[PDB]
Design a protein around this ligand. Structure first.
Ligand SMILES: Nc1ncnc2c1ncn2[C@@H]1O[C@H](COP(=O)(O)OP(=O)(O)OP(=O)(O)O)[C@@H](O)[C@H]1O
Ligand SMILES: Nc1ncnc2c1ncn2[C@@H]1O[C@H](COP(=O)(O)OP(=O)(O)OP(=O)(O)O)[C@@H](O)[C@H]1O
Ligand SMILES: Nc1ncnc2c1ncn2[C@@H]1O[C@H](COP(=O)(O)OP(=O)(O)OP(=O)(O)O)[C@@H](O)[C@H]1O
Ligand SMILES: Nc1ncnc2c1ncn2[C@@H]1O[C@H](COP(=O)(O)OP(=O)(O)OP(=O)(O)O)[C@@H](O)[C@H]1O
Ligand SMILES: [Mg+2]
Ligand SMILES: [Mg+2]
Ligand SMILES: [Mg+2]
Ligand SMILES: [Mg+2]
Lengths: 249, 249, 249, 249
């Protein structure tokens, strides 16, 4: 097999390359994410969750990702630098994987998002008027700094900061939530990911996973794509969720 | 067919009975629900959502319920008194139903809940220490006035008041949320309804759907039951959710 | 001088008694608070914040209180058991004090509260309809589990749990906030403590500082009293607030 | 006297000018705010609250402002276009005024704010790391979209949208609150307006009342200024607050 090792910082990389060599895996090193990562049997990401999001932005078909967490919280990672070798051995030898859905947005045709699509004001400290439609029916209209359409994996990201619920990773859904809504009452809405979401706003920008962005005016449609994020199986993902969330800062 | 008409107040009853008589349905009137309601082909509830919850408290096997809303919000009802005949005719003639899961609780055998099981302090204005386990793993411990385990149908009830998300009726899940938690940070958790929930607390009471209560100490288990709530299909349930929620008060 | 030492647990008391004798202060020991505490030059509380609230419940005229924290967070305390001697000596030799307003409630004439007056449903898991008036004008009506009228000192107590803001101890105000409000929109209100607050509710109970309660129906009036809680000056009160708050749980 | 009439829209201006003429007031019309407005006895603003904020940005010494609300909620206005002549007459004849403090920030000397100073990320969807100091002590560090330092008048503006409390206009304080904080726990802080606020952030912009803005890096200080906003007395300001807030959208 051949693996790609993607690292934001140079630390721990020689060690990981050595461990992979013991597993009879050929290694190629990447200091930046690349679409060439599609040509590998699996990917080892060294960094936090953002490294993983930036890797995913290069992949349509996704080789399974193994994350070694040097960042902050590491909801998408599998191991720490202090003990990754055993978990990596398990992952390569069993080769069991999990798939989580990614969403596409009509404003950025070739871009996929694991966490969220956010619609924001082009100008900080100015609001936009956002209308939300789900399966063709207008369900809300609200003045806000922006509006988030997150997956369940994104429930612990931007949506969390905006006041959203923590949703377990195996419950497929969208979380629909405004950022700084100028209204007396508002609630996050949690809907089936099989539904079509439309967000309508003028003078806005759309951002996927905090990485890629574009101006738009009028309507954008957001729907589940055919190209999920693929990770090695983390048997502790549900258990670890609650502790990791409490450490978010 | 034979239908039971169950009413909180006697207003509108005679006209609903005459409407059923015109549909060639035999009618029996009930001023309070009873277990006898299982013997009918369908049930027409005249009242708000609480009337429906009280009807369900008496039903294991559930004949389809049609709700005529004389209450405040009416998330579980199908029509208003001003225009119910057309919708009632459609309901009886098509006889299409929807089933929503109910949960059971180990402290109260033979009691089912559509909205929530809530564990509260026995002493008002006094907190209880609550531990929460999901599929056998302790995921949180928190001091609070009480703790709610809600279905998605219950997301617009007690869980809503406690600060929970609005969840669409066709996404099956539990919402796990504290009432007045004494902690710097906390979040609602949304998990699969296939999971087993355990709530552990001393000096508490457990309440199903705001209707039935028992004192308990120690552990209670909450799980999906085999006996759902059955309603005639409301083709506008999803569309109506958003406007109805905004009117909550 | 003579000091009362009030303790919830038996443990650290002999140590505190010896420290006071070295400061030439006669000591009397109390396992429970009583009205006799008014007859002392000052009071040393050994416990958490609840022990201080229970002391205050017995005091109209309030000798200065010095708190030694054996409870959880201790916003009302001055020192810990591990190092209290130097702070106690400074407190007594300087005898500088701080006064924090307490409020009274028309339902319980001789009862005073430092944190809050709370109006709650007499029936567990059932809402009450609460109307709120400030300086004679009805400002809100809401269905809720209860309603809190807190001082700024109470902003880190029940009001905090209900979702209220943290208000610094030297900004005199009321925080008005519902517990589990069944409404799409609601906000905590912060008003001058010179204003008269009226809460109107049927089938309710009123509770002062989580300690003393009575059933009531109709209108209660809540206002600032002439008998503040008196503490030795804590020079680090403002500074310590933020760290202590982050530790609540 | 001489009055300036400032108008966002040109609709009711002729009506207002003729009314001032009846009160023997010399009128000068302004299509937009100018520092020349300082040279009038009073100012009549035709528009919503934003028009008033833009007028104030051009004023150090503030002639009393009378607001005619063509906007949406109009917390700073005194009358609607349908009935302004009676309230305007009372204002000119009694000439009773109210002063509300404005704040300055060190990044923009000579710029004053009535609602808030907000520190925001320069890039949408990108967080900044913000440290907050009050009277010289660091009281929080948080990753967020931005951070708001509001006056009590600003409690119904950006701070409101960010989840802050509603504070009555006659209780002077700062409300310190993050916008979309990436942390498990957070609270708004309400502190005395006598305190000095320092916000520290890199790659940020500071914005006064949603109008004037500048890039900054490092530290900014925010303090109460000597130049309040001056309005004609609105006898119903406290009473109207609660209804106006509930209509915010
Ligand atoms: N308040 C917030 N504003 C923007 N993004 C947020 C916020 N809170 C959580 N996030 C999450 O951050 C994710 C992007 O993570 P990322 O690691 O790229 O950003 P970062 O850690 O702040 O800094 P950098 O992009 O430079 O690594 C988004 O997908 C979003 O879900
Ligand atoms: N804050 C709250 N406290 C208790 N229950 C709540 C609250 N908010 C919403 N509810 C919902 O109310 C439901 C009970 O409905 P019910 O109609 O019996 O209550 P009610 O309308 O307040 O009382 P009643 O109908 O007997 O006059 C519960 O299942 C719960 O989901
Ligand atoms: N969720 C909550 N419910 C009730 N009280 C709360 C809550 N959160 C904070 N408090 C505060 O707790 C105060 C009472 O403190 P007290 O020490 O008596 O309670 P306790 O610590 O829970 O019980 P105890 O000390 O008897 O073991 C109240 O004045 C209130 O301000
Ligand atoms: N979510 C929000 N984002 C930014 N400002 C907000 C927000 N919610 C309320 N505000 C308030 O809006 C004020 C600015 O008012 P302003 O009238 O200029 O904005 P506007 O109503 O969006 O109109 P416009 O941007 O065209 O001038 C700020 O001082 C702030 O207090
Ligand atoms: Mg990052
Ligand atoms: Mg009811
Ligand atoms: Mg206690
Ligand atoms: Mg405006």
């Amino acid at each position: 097999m051949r693996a790609a090792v993607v690292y934001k910082t140079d630390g721990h990389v020689k060690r990981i390359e050595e461990a992979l060599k013991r597993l009879e895996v050929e290694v190629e090193l990447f200091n930046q994410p690349s679409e060439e990562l599609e040509n590998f049997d699996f990917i080892v990401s060294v960094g936090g969750d953002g490294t993983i999001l930036r890797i995913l932005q290069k992949l349509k078909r996704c080789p399974p990702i193994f994350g070694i967490n040097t960042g902050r919280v590491g909801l998408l990672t599998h191991a720490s630098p202090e003990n990754f070798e055993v978990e990596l051995k398990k992952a390569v030898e069993k080769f069991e994987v999990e798939r989580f859905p990614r969403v596409s947005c009509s404003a950025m045709p070739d871009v996929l998002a694991l966490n969220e699509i956010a619609v924001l004001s082009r100008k900080p400290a100015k609001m936009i008027d956002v209308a939300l439609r789900v399966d063709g029916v207008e369900v809300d209209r609200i003045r806000c700094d922006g509006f988030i359409v997150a997956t369940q994996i994104g429930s612990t990201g931007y949506a969390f900061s905006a006041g959203g619920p923590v949703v377990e990773p195996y419950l497929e859904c969208f979380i629909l939530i405004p950022i700084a809504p100028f209204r007396f009452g508002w609630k996050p809405y949690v809907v089936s990911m099989e539904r079509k979401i439309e967000v309508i706003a003028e003078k806005a920008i759309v951002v996927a996973d905090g990485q890629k962005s574009v101006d738009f005016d009028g309507e954008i449609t957001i729907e589940k794509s055919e190209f999920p994020a693929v990770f090695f199986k983390n048997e502790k993902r549900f258990r670890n969720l609650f502790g990791k969330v409490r450490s978010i800062g």
